[PDB]
Amino acid sequence: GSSGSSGRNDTECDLCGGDPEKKCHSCSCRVCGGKHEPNMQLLCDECNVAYHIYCLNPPLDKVPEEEYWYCPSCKTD
Ligand SMILES: [Zn+2]
Ligand SMILES: [Zn+2]
Ligand SMILES: [Zn+2]
Numbered sequence: 001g002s003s004g005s006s007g008r009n010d011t012e013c014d015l016c017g018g019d020p021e022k023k024c025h026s027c028s029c030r031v032c033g034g035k036h037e038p039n040m041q042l043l044c045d046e047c048n049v050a051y052h053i054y055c056l057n058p059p060l061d062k063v064p065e066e067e068y069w070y071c072p073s074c075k076t077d
Contacts, residue, residue, distance in 0.1 A: 013026065013027055015027070020035075023035050026049055026050075027050060028041070028050050029041070029050060029051055029052045029055050030049060030050075030051065031051065031052065031055035031056075031057075032052065032055050034052065034055075037052065038050075040052060040053050040054075040063060042060075042063070042064070042069045042071070043069070044069070044070055044071035044073075044074055045068045045069070045070055046070060046071070046074045047071065047073065047074055049071050049073070051071055051072075056072060057072050
């Protein structure tokens with residue numbers, strides 16, 4: 001019915017709306033702007049952004065396996 005639900009501690013994506021077909025830059029690679037290869041996508045532990053292993057700067061020969069992975073847009077050296 002009417003729009004309500006006052007209590008709620010969540011949020012959706014407006015850049016795409018919340019769908020697979022709806023291409024996004026945040027939910028997926030922001031560099032090239034691709035929304036494929038969800039297995040080779042690295043998520044940031046700060047802004048929560050998906051980035052390909054071959055779209056970094058510098059790039060990545062493959063997927064890392066360290067403690068965590070932080071996008072190049074967050075890592076301030
Ligand atoms: Zn999105
Ligand atoms: Zn990419
Ligand atoms: Zn980040």
